[PDB]
Write a protein that binds this DNA or RNA. Structure first.
Ligand SMILES: [K+]
Ligand SMILES: [K+]
Ligand SMILES: [K+]
Ligand SMILES: [Mg+2]
Ligand SMILES: [Mg+2]
Ligand SMILES: [Mg+2]
Ligand SMILES: [Mg+2]
Ligand SMILES: [Mg+2]
Ligand SMILES: [Mg+2]
Ligand SMILES: [Mg+2]
Ligand SMILES: [Mg+2]
Ligand SMILES: [Mg+2]
Ligand SMILES: [Mg+2]
Ligand SMILES: [Mg+2]
Ligand SMILES: [Mg+2]
Ligand SMILES: [Mg+2]
Lengths: 65, 273, 122, 87, 92
RNA sequence: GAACUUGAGUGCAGAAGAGGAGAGUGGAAUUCCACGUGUAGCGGUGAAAUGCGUAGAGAUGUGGAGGAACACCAGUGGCGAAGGCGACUCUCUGGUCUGUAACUGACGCUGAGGAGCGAAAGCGUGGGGAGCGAACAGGAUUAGAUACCCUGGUAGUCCACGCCGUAAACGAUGAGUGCUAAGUGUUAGGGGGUUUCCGCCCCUUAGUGCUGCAGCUAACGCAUUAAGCACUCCGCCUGGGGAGU
């Protein structure tokens, strides 16, 4: 596996960048593990924050199917 | 805050008092005072119609503005004052045009604060708006029931009501009691909890202090004689010795509900307390 | 300021050499030890610290030391001051005690002669 | 951030022009942080974790003040008067 | 440095849309803020309904205030019937 | 008394973090209430019964009220002196790590008493009370069953302020410092390779794990995060009961 954020050289994850965050959630809406996505620990923290901010303002869903 | 006195005598043991920290002056506004004689619980026939009322300290009435009807004119809080006629403190407002009025002092309010009434006022503690203009979840006090009549509900020290919802002509309001009730959306309310919230914690301490506040002794029914009370008589002490505890006038007095059946306001009471 | 443990630990694992922070008395101990046949030479360098040079004690030049099983003990912060008369001998000879004097060290004869017992080692 | 407090109590007893580690400067910065943190704790009475921070600063400052007093008796007296400490 | 995103209710004319946005910009600027950037994401489908609004107009603002401004934004944004969601995030 | 910079601090530049305090906010689920549809069960157990249901339950749909806890992320992962800390946002605020060495020049370590913090339960005053649930009741079970199981259910669990000061408060391992084979994960950094980066590789600091030398151990085991080799200071032990009386 390889980290999307380390490989592409992304050092900051916007909550508003929806299309990026859709790569790291399930069909149902649940945040995908590091085992599946292969992302780094530091980015997985930054990502998770971004997901949770997105869900607050209805950019991403809590639960959906 | 509550000041606890030291037990320097049996009278003083347990007694507590307000520190009166919020009070900023000792002298009321002379132009807003009116005379107020005691009545002893006696009606226009001269007869005692309410028990246990009598004596106490002489008091002057402070004319409170319960209507809050100087719309759009800003007013500055000049004082917070003791009022002997009610549990809450009152605030002298200096209006920009030179009119002075007293209002109930909300929790928080400071000398110098600007207050404002009317439909285009901010949701700040001390402002007063028609209930149609007050957001859901706002804590309010001094609620009108009839447009223009003045605030009647939620005036005592520390009391508060919350606006729950809007049904066009009516707004739902949770009252202090916990009763949820419909109030006309044109009825005003004042923003915030009423102040002097520690009032209920006061330990009156001695018999005499009750007498200063105009309360005369309560005699229990069970130590009266049968001609005075349903509980009267019996040799030695007696239990209630009746199907129900009774009032002095022979109604049941423990659980018996006394709100008039076929009250007109029943349609506006959503959830009872 | 305990070279002894540094020595013991390296001596246990049959180390060739060890770098001990230098001090006047730790220098003067290493030479007392060298009287047997440890240390070949050291490298005095441009002084930044006062001991960066170290002692560079090299008691294991060959694979196995001819002088092996080095052992010390008597070094407590509670001060142990020996009488010139009552200076001890480690193992009744076959071991030395670095008895710090105003002017002398080492054997029992180097006590009543030299004088101040002072420090006592083993 | 204030290098104001640095350049003040540098120059009073300056070893270097760009002295930072003078006891004067340290004690002054500690005094500024201590006093700032006290006013946090006036509001946040039950912030115990931060308050342990205060007690460490206080202990640093005391130890640096005991250091001056033993070192330079005059220099100590000048510092406590300007900061307005007692000990 | 703060980003202030907020959703406006979708039942809004473009006249009254501007009236809201211009008022909340004036809430920031009047209370000692400098609006150093704005953006309009426009009408979007919400991931979940809020206040019976399946969709809503998103609206970003960037400010370089000192707290009191963006604090005052929140209390007015909560009061207002037109702002249906809002956040304030500190910038990195 | 005079020096020094290796200890210990400061400055400067980075880094990570469920460290703490305050205010606000979000979604899911449970419960209750109202209403629509619908009709005879539901629920529960080892098996039952008490319960709840035709005064229409359960199920299903919609809305309302309220409280509490924060799926996924989540990891011998992180942070904290310990207790502990897990939705989001802002406000205030403590510490740690790395690098740089401009500055300070033993300013250090430990620390009886003292002062503070300290899970849960408990206590006081005032709130709140969905869910859970000591007590208590009923149903079972049983020789009995003041239990386990079932159905209810009060305090309490939650909040504010105050008190209490204890836990197998555990790593059953006091703190500080140095020294003494390796191998391999992982967290946050740093430097340096050929390379445009990514990436790979080497080195390195501080954590966090596993395996394992020497040494230690009554044995089990410990083993650079020592229970090894040392030094400093504190706490504690001296057969079992009686008695933490
Ligand atoms: K009394
Ligand atoms: K009585
Ligand atoms: K009687
Ligand atoms: Mg009465
Ligand atoms: Mg009688
Ligand atoms: Mg009678
Ligand atoms: Mg009778
Ligand atoms: Mg009798
Ligand atoms: Mg003791
Ligand atoms: Mg508790
Ligand atoms: Mg309690
Ligand atoms: Mg049960
Ligand atoms: Mg104990
Ligand atoms: Mg524990
Ligand atoms: Mg123990
Ligand atoms: Mg200590």
């Amino acid at each position: 596996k390889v980290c999307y954020f380390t490989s592409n050289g992304i050092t900051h994850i916007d909550y508003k960048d929806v299309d990026l965050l859709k790569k790291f959630v399930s069909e149902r809406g649940k945040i995908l593990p590091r085992r599946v996505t292969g992302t780094n620990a530091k980015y997985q923290r930054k990502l998770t924050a971004a997901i949770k901010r997105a869900r607050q303002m209805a950019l991403l869903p809590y639960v959906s199917g | 805050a509550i000041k606890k006195y030291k037990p320097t005598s049996n009278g003083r043991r347990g007694m507590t008092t307000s520190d009166f920290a919020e009070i900023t002056t000792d002298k009321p506004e002379k132009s807003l005072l009116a005379p107020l004689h005691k009545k002893g619980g006696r009606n226009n026939q001269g007869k005692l119609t309410v028990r246990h009322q009598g004596g106490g300290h002489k008091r002057q009435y402070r004319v409170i503005d319960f209507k809050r009807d100087k719309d759009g004119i800003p007013g500055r809080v000049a004082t917070v004052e003791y009022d002997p006629n009610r549990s809450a403190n009152i605030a002298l407002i200096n209006y920009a045009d030179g009119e002075k009025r007293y209002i109930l002092a909300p929790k928080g309010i400071q000398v110098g604060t600007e207050i404002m009434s009317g439909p285009e006022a901010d949701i700040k503690v001390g402002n007063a708006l028609p209930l149609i203009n007050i957001p859901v979840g706002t804590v309010v006090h001094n609620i009108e029931l009839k447009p223009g009549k003045g605030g009647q509900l939620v005036r005592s020290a520390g009391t508060s009501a919350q606006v729950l919802g809007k049904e066009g002509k009516y707004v739902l309001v949770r009252l202090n009691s916990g009763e949820v009730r419909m109030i006309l959306s044109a009825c005003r309310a004042s923003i915030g909890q009423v102040g002097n919230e520690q009032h209920e914690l006061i330990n009156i301490g001695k018999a005499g202090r009750s007498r200063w506040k105009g309360i005369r002794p309560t005699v229990r029914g069970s130590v009266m004689n049968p001609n005075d009370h349903p509980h009267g008589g019996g040799e030695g002490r007696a239990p209630i010795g009746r199907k129900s505890p009774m009032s002095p006038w022979g109604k049941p007095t423990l659980g018996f509900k006394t709100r008039k059946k076929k009250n007109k306001s029943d349609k506006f009471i959503v959830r009872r307390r | 300021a305990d070279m002894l443990t540094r020595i013991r630990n390296a001596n246990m694992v049959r180390h060739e050499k060890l770098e001990i922070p230098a001090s006047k008395l730790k220098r003067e101990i290493a030479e007392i030890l060298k009287r047997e046949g440890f240390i070949r030479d050291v490298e005095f360098v441009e002084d930044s610290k006062q001991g960066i040079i170290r002692v560079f004690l090299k008691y294991g030049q060959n694979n196995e030391r001819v002088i092996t099983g080095l052992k010390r003990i008597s070094k407590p912060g509670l001060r142990v001051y020996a009488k010139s008369n009552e200076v001890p001998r480690v193992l009744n000879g076959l071991g030395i005690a670095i008895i710090s004097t105003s002017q002398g060290v080492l054997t029992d004869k180097e006590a009543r002669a030299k004088q101040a017992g002072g420090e006592v080692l083993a | 951030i204030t290098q104001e407090r640095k350049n003040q109590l540098i120059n009073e007893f300056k070893t270097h022009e760009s002295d930072t580690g003078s006891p004067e400067v340290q004690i002054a910065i500690l005094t500024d942080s201590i006093n700032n943190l006290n006013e946090h704790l006036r509001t946040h009475k039950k912030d115990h974790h931060s308050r342990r921070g205060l007690l460490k600063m206080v202990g640093k400052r005391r130890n640096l003040l005991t250091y001056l007093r033993n070192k330079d008796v005059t220099r100590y007296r000048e510092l406590i008067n300007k900061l307005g400490l007692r000990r | 440095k703060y980003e202030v995103m907020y959703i406006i209710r979708p039942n809004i004319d473009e006249e009254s849309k501007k009236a809201v946005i211009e008022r909340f910009n004036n809430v920031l600027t009047s209370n000692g803020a400098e609006i150093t950037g704005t953006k309009d994401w426009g009408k979007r489908r919400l991931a979940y309904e809020i206040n019976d609004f399946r969709d809503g107009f998103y609206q970003i603002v960037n400010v370089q205030s000192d707290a009191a401004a963006v604090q005052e934004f929140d209390r007015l944004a909560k009061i207002s019937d037109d702002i249906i969601r809002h956040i304030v995030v500190k910038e990195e």
